[model samples]
Target: MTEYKLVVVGAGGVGKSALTIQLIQNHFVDEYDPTIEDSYRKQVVIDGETCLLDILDTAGQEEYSAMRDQYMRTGEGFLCVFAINNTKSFEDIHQYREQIKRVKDSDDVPMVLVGNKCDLAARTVESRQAQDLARSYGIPYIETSAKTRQGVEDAFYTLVREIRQH
Candidate 1:
């Protein structure tokens, strides 16, 4: 079995919480705020190999920027999030990438580019455009809609697959 810690980062209102909450599915319980360094552990199998996954669903507030260093320093894989309809959130991802590179001291870090709110595709970034960006960055890309529960597992599993490969 393998063990990994993954970090999820995205701007506010981009469905970061929605996505993470969906991934941690226990629908009968009340909502839990996964923002602000919340960590969760679960076991999953990828490529027929047993694995234990640890996830950090981080806060998106700029005010909490001070704490990101520690978040960036330790994660084995990362989920860079943005809303399909929000260009500003997409722009902010480059800065987040820089922080990841600096903190991890590696350009080949395992990461996946996540375009959230695919259900809102009529308003924002196109999947083709996001795919091209991920291509340029040498990472996998996925679009997810929390409401539809679409591509949610694909996004996380793709990152887990990448982590396992690394």
Candidate 2:
């Protein structure tokens, strides 16, 4: 089966692991803990084709920043995630994007912009803001809530589709 290596990148407390766990195990994690690194594998049918998805849930803390380029080099596609309620996390997305591009040495790398934690009532990053950013990068933007399992699959499947096109 064809395999797509997907990497999830975002700032700490942005629910990167939550989203990945929800997709892999169909369970929601309620606690907040800093993730150093985690890997998961799942087989699913996308567009009628069976394929394996090798997903890397990366550390979002600054201490793990040194490990970014290693995974960025192997990732076939990326999901740039940020929590909607946190402005700083949203801002950090730019650096992740640039770093991925720099490490890949390609501006046309397949990626998706993800706005996570949408289940919260308070919002700092509006949908329009994220949409405009994705538009500027010419990539798809998806809002997701790992706790509610909203838009989680779409975010991953979309990245797979982007890889397919790339």
Candidate 3:
């Protein structure tokens, strides 16, 4: 049996965790508490195939650096996200990506870069730079909106497509 594992990453409040929950569970938290005081895990079985989907819903703000050592031990493939209205969230991805590479100790993992919160595309600050960056990194990119559930499944399926091909 083949199981696919992934880590969800991005800066604070960029909907990194929201995207994680949305993809794996197709649900959202309205005002619930964050289980990931450090990090939390979720699993889902897709396409009659079971995948571990180890979602690294780590904090990317003040609380994240404290959780660095733990994140540095996470898996390979990643489902990285950024906010279209907040380009800085995308810029900080390098830090997170470096941490991921350092932890996995290999550049062999397939990663998907997502531009989330497209529901607010009217307020978007970044252009298609997300696509350019993902292209440069040899990864896939998607525009998603966990708020409206736009591109949510497409994002997950796209990752699986890229990863399973190898």
Candidate 4:
């Protein structure tokens, strides 16, 4: 089996941990931890191939921003997440995207733009807006709800596929 290093990044309170924990343990994390960083591994079949997914859940707080380049250097793929209900979170995705590209020193990288908290009724980031962003970057856009496990697997699985192609 092959192993892929995946990183989850977004602004604080965007539910990066929730999305990752939901995928790894089938549980939703309600409380925000402002995590420095957390890593998880899972073996799963993708395209009929069993592979190990080494996922890094990164901190969103600015205080831990210095730690980003280290993980970005080693990460094979990334999930650029944003909370659909928070416009600021949505706007922060651009910085994360640029930082990853800078660390990797490449224009092409495996990545997915994730709009989380889709379960919320009050959405500030519209679906079309996200779609346009993803289109501009030539990446896929997925809306997920860690609370309901919606699009949880698709987001991670798609990223793995993206890495394979890259």
Candidate 5:
């Protein structure tokens, strides 16, 4: 079977795990506690295909860097997330991508950028630049909202579909 490996990454409170949950369950979780000691996962079905996405939702603090590094070593595809409302998260993407390439020694993998929280229109920061950022990373991009059920599902499925082709 063709399985897609995805690592959802961003700064703390950027909604990486929430987006993952929304994509997996098509709903939002009311209460969220970042992450624990190690990586955890949940299987997700996108576009009618069962894709086992090993989501390494890292802890919000220091422990997360190690966890992040570990997952980057194994991840085949990445969903680099940043809240559309926070420019800091958006700017931090360069660090994440660099980490992936430096550790994995491969920049050719399919990585998709997601501008999360489209549900908050007023606070949006990067705007259309999010899509452009994905292009710069050599992948597709979209603004998705887990709360509104907007492009949440499509963003994940679209990347998996592309990975299947490769």
Candidate 6:
């Protein structure tokens, strides 16, 4: 089976790990202590074709900023995530994409802009705003709720398909 490397990038508490872990373990974890960096491997059947998915859950921290380029280089695709409740987190979407393109040296690289925490009743950042940002990059944008398990599968599935095509 072919293996694809995918890196999750976003600000802390943006549901990056929650979404990734939910997909890997198929369970919702309520209280999770923040982690610096961790990797997970799972065999996912996309389009009925099994492939190994190596996901690098990159933690959101200023200290990890220096290593962002290194983290992005090993991935075939990226999931740039942000919390819908935090406007500050939403602002970094462009920077994330630019950094990935710079490190990978490919503007056409596969990427998915994710707006997580959609299950929240009070969302400061609107979906249209995220959609606009994704539009600028010509990448697909999706909303997911890790807690409610909504759109979680679609996020990874979408990226894996993009990785396969790219």
TM-score of 5: 0.85
Name the runs in model 4 displaced over 4 angstroms.
Answer: none
Candidate 5 accuracy as lDDT? 0.74
Clashes (backbone N, CA, C under 3 Å), per candidate, total 1, 0, 0, 0, 0, 0
Highest lDDT model number: 2
Q: 1-166, model 4: which lDDT tens digit per residue? A: 7998999999988999999999999988988778899999999988899999999999999899999999999899999999999999999999999999889898798999999999999999999999999998889999999999999999999999999888
TM-score of each: 0.91, 0.99, 0.80, 0.98, 0.85, 0.96
lDDT of 6 at 6: 90
Candidate 4: give its CA RMSD in angstroms.
0.6
Predicted candidate 6 versus true structure: per-residue lDDT over 46-154, tens digit per residue: 8889999999998787677887888887889999999999899999777888899888888888999999989997899988988999988878899999998899889
lDDT of 1 by residue, 1-166 (tens): 5788999997866777788778877332235453666888889877787888898988888888899999898899999999989989988898888899999888888999999878764656777888898897789999888778889889999998888677
lDDT of 1: 0.84
TM-score of 2: 0.99
Task: Write down the lDDT of every candidate, Cα atoms only.
Answer: 0.84, 0.96, 0.71, 0.94, 0.74, 0.88
Clashing pairs in 3: none
lDDT of 3 by residue, 1-166 (tens): 5655556777777787677677667786455344353344545566777666555566667564867657556544677878888868888878777777777676756778888889884655454677788887788889888877899878876777777765
Which lDDT tens digits does candidate 5 get at residues 1-166? 3467777777777787787777666678767676653344556666676656665555545455776777788877778888888888888888888988788787677678888888886665766677677777788887888787788778777778767766
> Where does model 6 exceed 4 Å of error?
none
Error of 6 at 91 (Å): 0.1
Candidate 6: residue pairs that collide:
none
* Span of 10 residues, lowest total lDDT, candidate 4: 27-36
